[PDB]
Design a protein around this ligand. Structure first.
Ligand SMILES: c1ncc2c(n1)NCC2
Length: 330
């Protein structure tokens, strides 16, 4: 089997991407944030505290003839931005782009933090990291990809995120029309539960490539590119007036700037992030200070190749017995 679904930016800045997902019988379609950095599929639901729902589409398990309470199971998750959610668990039929999994754990939120309530465009998360990170207790649950993989034509999914435009998540096949050149594959460590790999270096604008190993994760659920402070300083030093602002919480730059590109290495190959992809707009409405899309990972404990990086590439998440990642230009 295969599946193919369009993923759409939630706003004009590509702050996140939503992909429609069919849950239950009859189908209830919710727009979920596909997140290769976490491993829980959770949804706003009829169980979510009413004051914490503001415009999201909810899953109502009592209206699904295939929903079953997973007795005793609870979940609770927190993300790197301080947001969180928790609840109980159903199993139900879940389909993405024509690919159907029966018995998928659908984690129903009883509580969500304020940033979730405040974002009416995201109805939940669909985790695509390794199932060892799944938070369901006392019986850990498998991700949608893990449940689907035996049925897929090939045990892979691909992320093709757009810049200010829709893109595609494919399951079970590699669309050879969706990228240019060849796909360069690179080793993955699953020891932390992530699609963790080692970039071979970087360049800023037209500058010379610096060969240096950068361990990080391919994370579609993180908006920005978080890299070591040395690398980020080298990038922003090429932007007149850019500075790190403690009050804002990262590097900012004059909105009048033209940003340089940023290149990262995948083996001997190179992925170029155009400068415009690094502009996250005014820090507050009407400001001429703009927020940078490349930020330091120094406070995080891991480097994160988030959407800013991944949207410059066609990315293969290869879930073969030994997982690997593939990157192609597009
Ligand atoms: C990283 N990964 C997932 C999410 C996040 N940050 N904020 C809300 C959901």
């Amino acid at each position: 089997s295969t599946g193919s679904a369009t993923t759409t930016p939630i706003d004009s800045l590509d702050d996140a991407y939503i992909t429609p997902v069919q849950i239950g019988t009859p189908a209830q379609t919710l727009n979920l944030d596909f997140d290769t950095g976490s491993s829980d599929l959770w949804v706003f639901s009829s169980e979510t505290t009413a004051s914490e729902v503001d415009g999201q589409t909810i899953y109502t398990p009592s209206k699904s003839t295939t929903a079953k309470l997973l007795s005793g199971a609870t979940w609770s998750i927190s993300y790197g931005d301080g947001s969180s959610s928790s609840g109980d668990v159903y199993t139900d039929t879940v389909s993405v782009g024509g690919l159907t999994v029966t018995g998928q754990a659908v984690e129903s939120a009883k509580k969500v933090s304020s940033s979730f309530t405040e974002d009416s465009t995201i109805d939940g998360l669909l985790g695509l990291a390794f199932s060892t990170l799944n938070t369901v207790s006392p019986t850990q649950q498998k991700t949608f990809f893990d449940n689907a993989k035996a049925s897929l034509d090939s045990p892979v999914f691909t992320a093709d995120l757009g810049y200010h435009a829709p893109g595609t998540y494919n399951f079970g096949f590699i669309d050879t029309t969706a990228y240019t050149g060849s796909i360069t594959y690179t080793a993955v460590s699953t020891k932390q539960g992530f699609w963790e790999w080692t970039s071979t270096g970087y360049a800023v604008g037209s500058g010379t490539f610096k060969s240096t190993s950068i361990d990080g994760i391919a994370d579609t659920g993180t908006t920005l590119l978080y890299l070591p402070a040395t690398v980020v300083s080298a990038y922003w030093a090429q932007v007149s007036g850019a500075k790190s602002s403690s009050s804002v919480g990262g590097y900012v730059f004059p909105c009048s700037a033209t940003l340089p590109s940023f290149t990262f290495g995948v083996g001997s190959a190179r992925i170029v992030i155009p400068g415009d992809y690094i502009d996250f707009g005014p820090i507050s409405t009407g400001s001429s200070s703009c927020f940078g899309g490349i930020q330091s990972s120094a406070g995080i404990g891991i480097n994160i190749f988030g959407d800013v990086a991944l949207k410059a590439a066609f990315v293969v998440f290869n879930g073969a017995t030994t997982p690997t990642l593939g990157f192609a230009s597009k």
